[PDB]
Amino acid sequence: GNNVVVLGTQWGDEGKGKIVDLLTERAKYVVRYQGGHNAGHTLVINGEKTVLHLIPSGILRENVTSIIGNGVVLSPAALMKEMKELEDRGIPVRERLLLSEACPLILDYHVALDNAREKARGAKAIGTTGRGIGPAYEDKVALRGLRVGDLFDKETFAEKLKEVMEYHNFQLVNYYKAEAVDYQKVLDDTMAVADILTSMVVDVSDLLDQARQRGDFVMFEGAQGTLLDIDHGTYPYVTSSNTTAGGVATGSGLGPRYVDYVLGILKAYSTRVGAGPFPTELFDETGEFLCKQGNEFGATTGRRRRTGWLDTVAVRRAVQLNSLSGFCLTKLDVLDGLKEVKLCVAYRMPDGREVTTTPLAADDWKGVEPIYETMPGWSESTFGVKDRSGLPQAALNYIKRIEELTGVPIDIISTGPDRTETMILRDPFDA
Numbered sequence: 001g002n003n004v005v006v007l008g009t010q011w012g013d014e015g016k017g018k019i020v021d022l023l024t025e026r027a028k029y030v031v032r033y034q035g036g037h038n039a040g041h042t043l044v045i046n047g048e049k050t051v052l053h054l055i056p057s058g059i060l061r062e063n064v065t066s067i068i069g070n071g072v073v074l075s076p077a078a079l080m081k082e083m084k085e086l087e088d089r090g091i092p093v094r095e096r097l098l099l100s101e102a103c104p105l106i107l108d109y110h111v112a113l114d115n116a117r118e119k120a121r122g123a124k125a126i127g128t129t130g131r132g133i134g135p136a137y138e139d140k141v142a143l144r145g146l147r148v149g150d151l152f153d154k155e156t157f158a159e160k161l162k163e164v165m166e167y168h169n170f171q172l173v174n175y176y177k178a179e180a181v182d183y184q185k186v187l188d189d190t191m192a193v194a195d196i197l198t199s200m201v202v203d204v205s206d207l208l209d210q211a212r213q214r215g216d217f218v219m220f221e222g223a224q225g226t227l228l229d230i231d232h233g234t235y236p237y238v239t240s241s242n243t244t245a246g247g248v249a250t251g252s253g254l255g256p257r258y259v260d261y262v263l264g265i266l267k268a269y270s271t272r273v274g275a276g277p278f279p280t281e282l283f284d285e286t287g288e289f290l291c292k293q294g295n296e297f298g299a300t301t302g303r304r305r306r307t308g309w310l311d312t313v314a315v316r317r318a319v320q321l322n323s324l325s326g327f328c329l330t331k332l333d334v335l336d337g338l339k340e341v342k343l344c345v346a347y348r349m350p351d352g353r354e355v356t357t358t359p360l361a362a363d364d365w366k367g368v369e370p371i372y373e374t375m376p377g378w379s380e381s382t383f384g385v386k387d388r389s390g391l392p393q394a395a396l397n398y399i400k401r402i403e404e405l406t407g408v409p410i411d412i413i414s415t416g417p418d419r420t421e422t423m424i425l426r427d428p429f430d431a
């Protein structure tokens, strides 16, 4: 298909950045449609590592035009910082990056609010990434957020900014008993890069429409993971945007009917960072093994990721919500050596009922128990392997079982962090 979507089928950190960087060899555009710099997408080319946050993953390819869609909450500070680091490494970001005027702006006070709220929650904190993602999303819907377009008239901007900030500072000092964020500073800081941002504005939705009518290959790059979805995830332990496929259309402006292929990045074992339900979570040796071997640490916050077995019940919620066309099994190599490996095929509800469907809000996952099928592991090394033939039978079996339980084919398989340690059985762009 011409328009392919790459998203997280679990709780993020499945390996979107790599897969996007890999497949954008043929793409004209790469589009981020939701999230902000809470994302940490790691690319590894010939050993050289790049972890992107707000900047799309096609940025390392000069043939591709990277676009930040209206769904993304954009931090001018974050953007500039990332932009500088990439430029110093020879990537001419401004020549390859374009953005929407409809993107809400993430400014200093958003981070304060986030911190304030996170503290207020005490023991029942979300475990947010410390940026002002949710607050930025609130303002937007609240009809008071600033957008990139606003930066086009600086006096008007100042007016709008003083208001919203008076509003925010009031609740920050009086209600939260936290320190106020200075207006003049935010204005000065923001006005310093206004022009650079502004220079990259394009009418994203009209562009994608044009790209489409020409048959250009477009890739949409997801952020976070399905179970982190504001509507469908483990509310309130979620991120404030739609991480499910529906966000491509809302967050980019492309008509829903133009999504040709939805690729689901599936990790091979599960990780979760932040508070929230995690049925298959492991606190024993293997959990630890999974964390070490998989170097499972937040590509953004650096905190250790919770690990557990692959949850087929949870993944199947993902298959239907995102109308998955296919899977990309990642981190297979991380299982090398395990005597046996298991996967959750059902949930035991606190009232004795056996179920193969997931609860929705967090509270409803409370005493849920996983029911596993158990498979033999493999001692052979699958790292870097790029041909099914090099995979041991247990592995091939494990793969097949996943396809059986889900009813979705694994079209791509990743055996390592480098762009090339991968096998593409079926290319989304040809499907």
Ligand SMILES: Nc1nc2c(ncn2[C@@H]2O[C@H](COP(=O)(O)OP(=O)(O)O)[C@@H](O)[C@H]2O)c(=O)[nH]1
Pocket: 008, 012, 013, 014, 015, 016, 017, 018, 039, 040, 041, 042, 043, 044, 295, 298, 299, 330, 331, 332, 333, 334, 414, 415, 416, 417
């Ligand atoms: N061994 C191994 N590491 C991988 C593979 N795919 C990606 N990685 C690494 O696993 C992590 C994926 O996490 P992250 O970058 O946060 O995922 P993302 O946020 O979806 O892009 C990063 O360290 C990648 O470099 C794979 O097949 N095998």
Ligand SMILES: O=P(O)(O)OC[C@H]1O[C@@H](n2cnc3c(OP(=O)(O)O)ncnc32)[C@H](O)[C@@H]1O
Pocket: 008, 011, 012, 013, 014, 038, 039, 040, 041, 126, 127, 128, 129, 130, 131, 133, 134, 222, 223, 224, 225, 228, 237, 238, 239, 240, 273, 274, 275, 276, 299
């Ligand atoms: O308000 P937020 O700052 O977004 O945090 C809310 C919650 O969502 C989690 N979280 C946010 N972005 C995440 C991510 O991005 P990528 O997969 O794109 O690399 N991967 C994994 N977990 C992620 C946070 O830990 C917390 O549970």
Ligand SMILES: O=CN(O)CC(=O)O
Pocket: 012, 013, 038, 039, 040, 041, 129, 273, 297, 298, 299, 300, 301, 302, 303
């Ligand atoms: O890659 C990004 N995530 O893991 C978010 C975090 O670091 O918590």
Ligand SMILES: [Mg+2]
Pocket: 012, 013, 014, 039, 040, 041, 042, 299, 300
């Ligand atoms: Mg990540």
